[PDB]
Design an enzyme around this catalytic site. Structure first.
Site, short mmCIF file in Angstrom:
data_model
loop_
_atom_site.label_atom_id
_atom_site.label_comp_id
_atom_site.label_asym_id
_atom_site.label_seq_id
_atom_site.Cartn_x
_atom_site.Cartn_y
_atom_site.Cartn_z
N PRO A 105 0.85 -1.19 0.00
CA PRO A 105 0.00 0.00 0.00
C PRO A 105 0.89 1.24 0.00
CG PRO A 105 -0.85 -1.62 1.49
CD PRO A 105 0.55 -2.04 1.16
N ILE A 106 0.47 2.27 -0.71
CA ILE A 106 1.25 3.49 -0.80
C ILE A 106 0.93 4.52 0.29
CG2 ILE A 106 2.02 5.34 -2.35
CD1 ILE A 106 0.10 2.21 -3.55
N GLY A 109 3.60 4.55 5.28
CA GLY A 109 4.80 4.16 6.01
C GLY A 109 5.36 2.75 5.87
N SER A 113 7.80 3.27 -1.98
CA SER A 113 8.72 3.86 -2.96
C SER A 113 10.11 3.27 -2.90
CB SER A 113 8.83 5.37 -2.76
OG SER A 113 7.68 6.04 -3.23
N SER A 115 11.04 0.39 -1.95
CA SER A 115 11.04 -0.99 -2.41
C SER A 115 11.19 -0.98 -3.93
CB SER A 115 9.74 -1.67 -2.00
OG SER A 115 9.85 -3.07 -2.12
N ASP A 156 13.94 3.58 5.43
CA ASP A 156 13.32 2.74 4.41
C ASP A 156 14.31 1.97 3.57
OD1 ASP A 156 11.00 3.81 5.35
OD2 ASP A 156 10.56 5.02 3.54
#
Length: 314
Positions: A105-106, A109, A113, A115, A156
């Site tokens: 899901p965008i 958190g 992006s 990934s 991230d």
């Protein structure tokens, strides 16, 4: 003609405190993006967003000079390609196509992006049979973020590149092994996309900054990590998750929808807490295999999206 499956990421504890010199406990999760790259022989590069059924074609000589934020949804992958190339000091002679599909899901958190970015870097490098150390990849991802957003945190990109469980502090990480890593290999979690995030992450950071009790809260948040790091059972761990949640709640970046989800999590699971900046998003729940069937029914009785996910190792 390789296929890259890049991991996702979730903060277990530390959400906003990390920002003030405190620690963040980040974990790589099953939710993956999948990027497939294959040469075409048409003299251009093609990017294809399957999930959004969007497509883009560019000449091999526009690559290094394009500006990422001119290409909407294709910007991160695009930018990942440009940087990997000049980093490898390669000039596209032949063409190729990339197919992009993520399950993540965008804007909630989970590192959606990053990934895509980490999978594009590994894809383009491998397509040229030149490989990079996790060290080089992590930085290339971080730079893609910085380039696009103006600024960036390693969280991230580092988390998704080194996989496993990381401790983030200031702007450097610490890999976590031992019993804690062992214990987590044994936990099944659930990411529940309670509601969309109508607010910008920086906007929430500012709302947390504008809080007096903030620091004293961060300290309690850090003591929770002290304890978490040393925990042995899912029963104790779950509650610690719930406690951190009660703290995030004190930064009023939580929402009535998240709290409901967290409730179901404490009762039908081992504990639960939202993940990332507040104002909507996901709640992560430690699954209790015993009432697992229960957990689902109650959760399912909600306007939410759920995802089965376990930690991701090397």
């Amino acid at each position: 003609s390789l296929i890259i499956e890049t991991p996702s990421k979730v903060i277990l504890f530390g959400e906003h405190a990390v920002v003030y010199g405190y620690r963040a406990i980040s974990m790589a999760i099953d939710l993956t993006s999948t990027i497939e790259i294959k040469e075409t022989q048409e003299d251009e590069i093609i990017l294809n967003l399957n999930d959004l059924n969007k497509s883009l074609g560019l000449n091999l000589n526009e690559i290094k000079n394009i500006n990422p934020n001119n290409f909407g949804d294709f910007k991160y992958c695009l930018c990942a390609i440009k940087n990997t190339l000049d980093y490898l000091n390669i000039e596209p002679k032949t063409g190729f196509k990339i197919n992009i599909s993520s399950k993540i899901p965008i804007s909630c958190g989970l590192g959606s992006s990053a990934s895509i970015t980490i999978g594009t870097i590994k894809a383009v490098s491998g397509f040229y049979n030149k490989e990079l150390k996790d060290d080089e990849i992590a930085k290339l991802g971080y730079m893609v973020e910085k380039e696009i957003q103006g600024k960036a945190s390693i969280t991230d990109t580092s988390t998704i590149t080194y996989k496993g469980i990381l401790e983030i502090k200031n702007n450097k990480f610490r890999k976590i092994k031992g019993e804690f890593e062992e214990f987590l290999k044994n936990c099944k979690f659930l990411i529940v996309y309670a509601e969309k995030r109508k607010k910008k992450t920086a906007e929430l950071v500012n709302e947390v900054a504008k809080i007096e009790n903030k620091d004293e809260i961060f300290k309690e948040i850090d003591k929770v990590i002290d304890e978490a790091l040393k925990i042995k059972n899912k029963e104790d761990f779950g509650k610690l998750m719930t406690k951190n949640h009660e703290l995030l709640k004190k930064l009023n970046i939580s929402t009535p929808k998240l709290d409901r989800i967290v409730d179901i999590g404490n009762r039908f699971g081992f504990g639960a807490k939202l993940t990332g900046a507040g104002g909507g998003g996901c709640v992560i729940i430690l699954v209790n295999e015993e009432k697992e069937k229960e957990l689902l029914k109650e959760l399912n009785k909600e306007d939410v999206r759920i995802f089965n996910c376990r930690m991701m190792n090397e």
